[PDB]
């Protein structure tokens, strides 16, 4: 049985490992299929327990990963691709 | 620099901790506001790398969390709510 303060703390806006499809990070590369099709990135998630407050990053950094670029029925090559990651998060008023 | 096999293994359909809004797990309780408004649950996620294949659970358990049920402008109480969790996942045709 998870105690209130545990859930509360563990659930509040922070960077959490998040599985993100590569195509949505790189919309312009539809001639390709990627393996993997998604990557594990640290991204702001959780609740602000508040409302039109939103859980946004205030500190970012890049990370470079080895992804298979595949041209379907023609070939495949493992290249380096770069992705955004979230270092700090914070609940901020919206627009 | 994250190596190919690291990424592939770590991205493929498993249970991962996932922040889920309570309202969506209990859409009938609109009178209430919850604190926290979301919970950390093990849920299937990631890529099947394949296509109309789909990352679904094949094994579940319930977990019970202490959550604050708030009746706006009237009162607040900590009660217990149960949430579905995901122990194993698999890539299945849709």
């Amino acid at each position, epitope marked *: 049985v998870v105690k209130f303060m545990d859930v509360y703390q563990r659930s509040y806006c922070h960077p959490i490992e998040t599985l993100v499809d590569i195509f949505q990070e790189y919309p312009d590369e539809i001639e390709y299929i990627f393996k993997p099709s998604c990557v594990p990135l640290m991204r702001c998630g959780g609740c602000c327990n508040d409302e039109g407050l939103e859980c946004v990053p205030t500190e970012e950094s890049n990370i470079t990963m080895q992804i298979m670029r595949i041209k379907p029925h023609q070939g495949q090559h493992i290249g380096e691709m770069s992705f955004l990651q979230h270092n700090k998060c914070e609940c901020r008023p919206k627009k | 620099v994250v190596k190919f096999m690291d990424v592939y293994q770590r991205s493929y*359909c498993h249970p991962i901790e996932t922040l889920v809004d309570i309202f969506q797990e209990y859409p009938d309780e609109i009178e209430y506001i919850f604190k926290p408004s979301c919970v950390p649950l093990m849920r299937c996620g990631g890529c099947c790398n394949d296509e109309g294949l789909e990352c679904v659970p094949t094994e579940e358990s319930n977990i019970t969390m202490q959550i604050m049920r708030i009746k706006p402008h009237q009162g607040q109480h900590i009660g217990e709510m149960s949430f579905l969790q995901h122990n194993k996942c698999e890539c299945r045709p849709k």
Partner: antibody
Amino acid sequence: EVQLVESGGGLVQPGGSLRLSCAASGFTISDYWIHWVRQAPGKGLEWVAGITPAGGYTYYADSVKGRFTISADTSKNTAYLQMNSLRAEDTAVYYCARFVFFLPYAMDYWGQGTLVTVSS
Amino acid sequence: DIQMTQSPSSLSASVGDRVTITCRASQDVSTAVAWYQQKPGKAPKLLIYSASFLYSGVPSRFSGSGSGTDFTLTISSLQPEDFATYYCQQSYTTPPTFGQGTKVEIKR
């Protein structure tokens, strides 16, 4: 010309070990996964070992788990199948083969086979 | 734990005959199937990948079709050189397996 050149089979004692080489030329092996398929005398193709696409984990046939281990030296552009404590029923022609994504889930180049015969 | 059952186990067909080998996976596997021809003692050769696609180099009289559990190698017009053992293989859900094979001889 792309091809896969195996070697290193032949005659072994029961309980002995062997390691097969699968040397790639005309392409770079780190961009692929090399699977191993074998075939006993007058029997069908049995899949042996290889990194599988569901989970990316090296997987081994039940009949072989814990004795066979694939490795790879990408500076030699070669892959290996280390075979340990060989049982008589390992006697087969072993093929290595190029597992591919771009021709989905297919094996497009194969080595010529090496006879591995297990007998005292 | 998945299986692949080819039909028939073996057949004789005259030069010119339409030949159909079927292949029935006990579980669903999309179009993630290939067919390989293997001439006696020699390394298997890729005929068909992703269920219906013809590997480049292979003669047009080979075709593949199907998804789910039921799959079909067709040879529209059998040549004398086509005698071999034909295999289906699945490599998409673990474990990867082959069918038992279908030995084709030429009837004359």
